[PDB]
Amino acid sequence: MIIPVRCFTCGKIVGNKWEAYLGLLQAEYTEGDALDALGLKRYCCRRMLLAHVDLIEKLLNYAPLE
Amino acid sequence: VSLPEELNRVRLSRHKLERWCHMPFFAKTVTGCFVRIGIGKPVYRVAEITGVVETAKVYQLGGTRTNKGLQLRHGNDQRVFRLEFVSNQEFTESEFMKWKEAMFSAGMQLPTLDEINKKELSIKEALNYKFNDQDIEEIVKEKERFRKAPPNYAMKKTQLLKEKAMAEDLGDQDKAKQIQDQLNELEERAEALDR
Amino acid sequence: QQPMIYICGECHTENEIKSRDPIRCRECGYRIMYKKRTKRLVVFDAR
Ligand SMILES: [Zn+2]
Ligand SMILES: [Zn+2]
Prior knowledge:
Coiled coil (chain B): 170-195
Subcellular location (chain B): Nucleus, Nucleoplasm
Domain Plus3 (chain B): 1-128
Number of helices of chain A: 4
Structural class of chain A: mainly alpha
Oligomer: part of a larger assembly
Distance between the termini of chain A: 23 Å
Protein name (chain B): RNA polymerase-associated protein RTF1 homolog
Bound molecules: zinc ion
Keywords (chain C): DNA-directed RNA polymerase, Metal-binding, Nucleus, Transcription, Zinc, Zinc-finger
Shape of chain A: globular
């Protein structure tokens, strides 16, 4: 529902990289290049950004008030 | 009645009036108490609550909003007032003496102490009044009368209601008005979502 | 002196509901309303 804070297997902080990864994908980069541009060497930490689903948006659509 | 402390007991502050904006018997429980209406520089004048009136101007008072007036009178000078100008300050000695002098000049006999004693209980008993009767319907109707509909979560419900009314109504002008209102509501919702 | 404040369903407006009273919002009028969080010492361990 939200990007984790750390890679389950490794432990490297990955939570602070979701917005950057999205920006890099948006401008021109491709995933395979954006991932190493952020500095994710081990394939264990890449699954965090590739596989992660972003449901928090759908959750925010149900605004309590206004 | 010659003391200010006893006279402040029935003073209707600005925080208490917010809980009876639509309660019935407003002309019975309110009529009799005194308020510190602000005239405007820091001088205040106490006036008697003769009755209740309704102004054509709609104003918001903090969270809620009411357009009802208050026909007050200070000895002989009377005019329309509003519930927003009332202050929460208690009757000072100077204002108490000014009110006593105004009453004596106007010839209105000062209300007896027992009168205030038996009237102050009216607000107390009305506050804890159980809403078992069919008053909530009138309260909600009055609130929605001035309170605009789109706010805030009823956008989809309002749109569905408008569509249903338009479909039911076979008139052309009513159908066009309903369609226009629905389109405006949809556009406003789209704008809010984009923002 | 706690009148058991509630939260309207769609208005998301507070209401004062006491015992032996109908469950409705002060405005509009709906039949759903949730409670407000407790005031107790809700303490978690970030474990
Ligand atoms: Zn990893
Ligand atoms: Zn209601």
